[PDB]
Design a binder for this molecule. Structure first.
Ligand SMILES: Cc1ccc2c(c1)c(-c1ccccc1)c(-c1ccccc1)n2CCC(=O)O
Length: 134
């Protein structure tokens, strides 16, 4: 319990850096990059018992994952990858690893001041996505 208290709530995307390059590294095609890159998703995080749910709500796509920390699950990403995901807490940071087609990407989420900072890493490319409470 209480593991994710400071993450819970509704968050709105307020800044994005190097997301197109991240998406290129991931293998997202041109048209999806352009439309996905315009989106300003809300992120909705909730907890019930041991189950954490993370939703996106946007113009482009709505996504939803529910999971237990450390327990691998199937995920369909906003760009339509079918991945195997595992999410853990490492020193108060949610660490989300996605595996597909022999590739891997890691998304880290942390609270910093009044923001929720999301760092997406694919090989040598990092993108930073900053959210504030909605
Ligand atoms: C290609 C790609 C890769 C990673 C992506 C997305 C798209 C979208 C998304 C983009 C546009 C619309 C909807 C979802 C979201 C997302 C956003 C918020 C919540 C949960 C996941 N993530 C996680 C990183 C982020 O916070 O941006």
């Amino acid at each position: 319990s209480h593991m994710c208290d400071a993450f819970v709530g509704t968050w709105k995307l307020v800044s994005s850096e190097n997301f197109d390059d991240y998406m290129k590294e991931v293998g997202v095609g041109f048209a999806t990059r352009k439309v996905a890159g315009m989106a300003k998703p809300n992120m909705i995080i909730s907890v019930n018992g041991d189950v954490i749910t993370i939703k996106s709500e946007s113009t482009f796509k709505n996504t939803e994952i529910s999971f237990i920390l450390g327990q691998e699950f199937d995920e369909v990403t906003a760009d339509d990858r079918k991945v195997k995901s595992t999410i853990t807490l490492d020193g108060g940071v949610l660490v989300h690893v996605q595996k597909w087609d022999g590739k891997s990407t890691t998304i880290k989420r942390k609270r910093e001041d009044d923001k929720l900072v999301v760092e997406c890493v694919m090989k040598g490319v990092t993108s930073t996505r900053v959210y504030e409470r909605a």
